[PDB]
Design a protein around this ligand. Structure first.
Ligand SMILES: N[C@@H](CCC(=O)N[C@@H](CS)C(=O)NCC(=O)O)C(=O)O
Ligand SMILES: N[C@@H](CCC(=O)N[C@@H](CS)C(=O)NCC(=O)O)C(=O)O
Ligand SMILES: [Fe+3]
Ligand SMILES: [Fe+3]
Lengths: 294, 294
């Protein structure tokens, strides 16, 4: 789809994890950003695969584009990131929220990481602060710190010709589905409420691009909505819902959810900017699954 | 159910893993064996739980029984063993096939086990050889080496009043379901054929007790059959099927199966006689998931 004149956005949906990855291109310079890419992972066998990522590679080439940014909205709990795989193939710089350091501190300890694992986000090329601008060719973008699902979550705002899009990560879902859970380490429902109200203070017509979609009641996949529709109809956080009410709802709801299938594999990879842990003396890399701890 | 006069057998079915565990008691002395017990494991969160095992504990106490043996037919790929939990709670000796050492060697390397990991089966109290006798109170039992699904698989024969039962592990399944897969390390279809033909050389009326049952076509769970019915009707290995034909079938079938959900957690625990790996310096135990190896 094209927003304004030059904001080109392709959505790629991963069936296994319900993740929506994006290719965001400046139609003029052909520079692009890949957002929230997926490295396929079979937890039964420990096998990774680049099939989903290769779709992005092919689309970049089909467009004659050049990757400038490999972005992650947050340290995902439900899938492994393909950012390292894609930066290697395609170039560009990886970026993530500056509060990655807090996530690394917490999960470096949980997974008892090896003593060379950096907790200062240096695995990533660029650490983004709240309201910090960045460019995708001639497109002006801005990173927004929108925590609550995690302490580090970012949303990416991009504007062209007076129209705005925001890639909101796991904050809002489609209006019929609600909002993201707030029970992972350092998550907080009240904080998510405030983040979402900042997002919903953008102009009504602003397009909002989802990070996951779970096909509720078997409808087709959806990935884009507007500020106006969220404010009117989001089942969790429409305009009528105050902070306290949201917090009570969200916290009671979180108590009923199970862990994502891939939380332990995912976080320990994504905290390393999409690298597998360093191999042991036998040449094999291992995920570590903490027992009776998470 | 009672075989002969004094061979008491209770079956316990685990829905999550389709494992059938057994309590086998001498009705006279009340001495018993627990076979192929399940320690519940949620791979998403890394949590173990003793719910299934506690069913056995309760049944032992209800019977006023005393555990003499905690047995495993093989190093299971589909569930974690509760043998260590049950031996601590109830006493008795653990036993497993003497060829455990070959499994330990192979998986000690795969999981790059810590140096204190023994590859001589010393984690188990007793290592059983082919046709070796053992007692459950006044009941005469015999261990049979029946490899093919794994190099170390054992079947346990028990006799009373001229009637025989055999707990066959993952060799035969019910006649309508066939036989076990032969693709795990050191498995071999030809070897499994020969093992099954030894089992099917027992008297026709011999009862055979299954290790898994997968409710094919939505039928109710079944766990016991006879030598005669297997020879007549087993869809994979009835009397009419020769060795070469079985091998071609079994090998072509194995190429289509996926890994068990819990293969990597299960085998690194079961190779340790049901102990979790020893904790690291932070006091947490971890499973190791080899990446891109299995
Ligand atoms: N069953 C899913 C759980 C996915 C999940 O929990 N996703 C998070 C975002 S990372 C969420 O907020 N789900 C929202 C909800 O269920 O209300 C899985 O195993 O991946
Ligand atoms: N889907 C099952 C796979 C279970 C499995 O592979 N069971 C083995 C015994 S440990 C088997 O032989 N299956 C035989 C077949 O389907 O032909 C799981 O995830 O646990
Ligand atoms: Fe998320
Ligand atoms: Fe098995």
């Amino acid at each position: 789809m094209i927003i304004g004149n030059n904001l080109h956005v392709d959505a790629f949906y991963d069936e296994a994890t319900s993740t929506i990855s994006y290719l965001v291109m400046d139609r003029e310079t052909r520079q692009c950003a890949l957002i929230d890419s997926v490295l396929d992972y079979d937890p039964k066998s420990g096998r990774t695969c680049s099939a989903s990522a290769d779709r992005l590679v092919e689309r970049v080439n089909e467009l004659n584009a050049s990757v400038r940014w490999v972005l992650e909205t947050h340290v995902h709990a439900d899938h492994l990131s393909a950012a390292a795989y894609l930066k290697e193939k395609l170039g560009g710089h990886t970026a993530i929220g500056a509060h990655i350091t807090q996530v690394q501190k917490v999960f470096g300890a949980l997974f008892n990481a090896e003593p060379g694992f950096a907790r200062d986000g240096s695995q990533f090329d660029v650490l983004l602060e709240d309201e910090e601008g960045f460019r995708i060719g001639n497109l002006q973008a801005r990173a927004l710190h929108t925590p609550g699902h995690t302490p580090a979550c970012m949303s990416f705002m991009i504007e062209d010709a007076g129209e705005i899009a925001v890639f909101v990560g796991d904050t809002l879902f489609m209006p019929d589905y609600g909002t993201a859970r707030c029970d992972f380490p350092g998550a907080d429902a009240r904080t998510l409420y405030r983040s979402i109200r900042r997002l919903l203070a953008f102009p009504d017509q602003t397009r909002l691009f989802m990070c996951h979609d779970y096909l509720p009641g078997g409808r087709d996949m959806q990935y884009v909505t507007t500020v106006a529709e969220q404010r009117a109809s989001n089942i969790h956080i429409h305009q009528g819902i105050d902070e306290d009410s949201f917090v009570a709802m969200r916290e009671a709801r979180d108590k009923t959810l199970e862990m994502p299938v891939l939380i332990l594999p995912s976080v320990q990879v994504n905290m390393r900017s999409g690298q597998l842990p360093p191999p042991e003396a036998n040449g094999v890399s291992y995920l570590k699954i903490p027992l009776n701890k998470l």
